[model samples]
Target: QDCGLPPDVPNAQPALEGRTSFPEDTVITYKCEESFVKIPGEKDSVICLKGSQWSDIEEFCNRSCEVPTRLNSASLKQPYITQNYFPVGTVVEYECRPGYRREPSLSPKLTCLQNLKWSTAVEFCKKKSCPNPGEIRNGQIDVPGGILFGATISFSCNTGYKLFGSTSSFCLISGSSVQWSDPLPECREIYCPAPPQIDNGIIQGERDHYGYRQSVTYACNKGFTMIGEHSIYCTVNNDEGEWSGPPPECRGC
Candidate 1:
């Protein structure tokens, strides 16, 4: 018995040479069509079995590459996505996610080769970043990490100053630009004027200016008696400096 023409194999053709001979025990060889490649570890020929049956080949040949389904989030390139298969040496491209740009030094590309496998793709991208906020006057900035997207910076003043305005700023992204969300805060120094002039007493350790937590003492003239607490100090109240107690008086003897 003889198997009629060998069963059709995808992307392949038998080497019939236009001969129509019905025969048994005949070996027929097949070749892959141009631009198509053989599947790995599979034979390219079939034998006519004794019972008029042809040996079965699950797969023989296929296009060099199929859709690169393993790539990162992307709709594949433009016209390239519509096509189902690609030939060897074909290349593809990808789009970056929001807030990301293709990192420098590495292009966004994938190449198909004779091995029926696509080349590895590196998809690391650069994130939007804001300019350095710079140092503040009479204050300091605490930055735990980068100025990149979603990062934050906190502002603080020294012991004797008050922070005015926003205490912190955030890196926000705009149309192709990244900027801090708010203006840097101001650090105004807390101040208190010298204790009010005393009629018959003198202030101890009085200076041109008094800042928070500074203390002062009052003394009566030679034989005068003191009428109130002899000590006063500078303290913070409502973000301004004030005397801890009312000015003392020296009653005449």
Candidate 2:
């Protein structure tokens, strides 16, 4: 008659603590804590055997776990805050964090499994993407980062072209402000003024403006012969307009 308090198991206690009737050959049951599990293939009861003796028990329970409150790109769902106790084979769901969305085809459940006291699908959430910033003329939309929250979108004009307005933009949380930090930049065709003045020479096909890469010819006026460059073209320097080289000079032959 010696099944005293279910023999004091590590993670389990007798459910019938109030009942003090221990005759001969009595059986007592145990209730395990949420932090443990009934080990498979193990009996969960202590049997009152012969006089002043009880059934011996070795490890009738196994360990469970405590889960994390915060996760990467995710947050624990529900007030599991108060109920931190987790038993084996339990599933804890999670939700995406602010400025992020659930990635389809990924699991949001944090499972507390047996034979595993370790650490989801890794990244359970994806950043909320930003609206398209649209295309820029004569320039390229260079995305330094992804088109998601806190990403940077930069603008660059084509060679010989000039950029206008903001050179860069950003993804922002802007129901109050702009979705993109700055307005889209524009690319304008860089132009050059008529070729530089050359002494004793006349520029052929003179015009008010010369487009990017447009070339101009030069000739000596009758008596004077040409010297230096024979032709020059419109080019760019520091994003503004310039010339391929100095204007051809008309030297006296």
Candidate 3:
């Protein structure tokens, strides 16, 4: 509220102290009654001892503070840059990721020193994120701005293939770009100089000739025997690219 008393009316004045009074340079200090934090430096403690009805009255008030849903007031959330006391034309940047969405603000929320009255609602940024891929498993990606940079992450495949050598995420300059430890990961087929045939059932996965985690299924021609596992998945040995498990086999009945 922008209400101010006019010039002093010579002898016109209200009582002072215990009772409300209009004194010379009678400034009034204001505070929210409850369940609220006052916007700092909002009102001064002075007003004119003039004869005039106050035009604007600062009433006790309450309004929600802008915030991201993914993160709550209890989360590692920062105070609103321009919360309750947001001056007009003041610029407040909003950003979030990992769970919330970034909504666009309607008006430009920044003002220069001169034009210092806010004309827009508070601005807030939401949090949004995606799924993770590779070996280490599922963990939210949080990077410079909540979005995880590929450089911070690495990848790997289960044993089976020849265990081609490769590492992921290499840091070069001030954690800017990324060079994967391994150029590319592969799931190759199990090596059996004498190829095993699935004479009864069909296989589930394919056999990569040169990577890790290749799988095979078995299907009987029509009536023959049914051997071991219906599916055979070739896993890479942890230490090397050697096949850890034996290939699946289906014999004649």
Residues 1-253, model 3: lDDT tens digits: 3334332322223223454435454555444433333445443233554453442344323322323223331122245543554333334443443333345653323232333432343334332322333343222212233222233444444434333444344322223222233334444443533225544555444444534445456565556666555555444444344433444555565
Model 1 steric clash total: 0
Flag clash pairs in model 2.
Answer: none
TM-score of each model, in listed order: 0.56, 0.61, 0.27
Residues 45-144, model 2: lDDT tens digits: 8888776567877767767666664565678778654454565666777787766777788887777767544244566777777888889988999887
Give the higher-TM-score candidate: 1 or 2.
2
Residue lDDT tens for model 1, 12-77? 988876866547778888988876767656788888887888888656777778677744333466
Give RMSD to native, each candidate: 9.4, 8.5, 13.8
Model 3: weakest 10-residue lDDT segment is: 68-77
Instruction: Using TM-score as the measure, name the better of candidate 1 and candidate 3.
Output: 1
Model 3 segments more than 4 A misplaced: 1-23, 37-56, 63-81, 85-161, 167-182, 186-253
Error of 1 at 115 (Å): 8.3
lDDT of each: 0.79, 0.76, 0.39
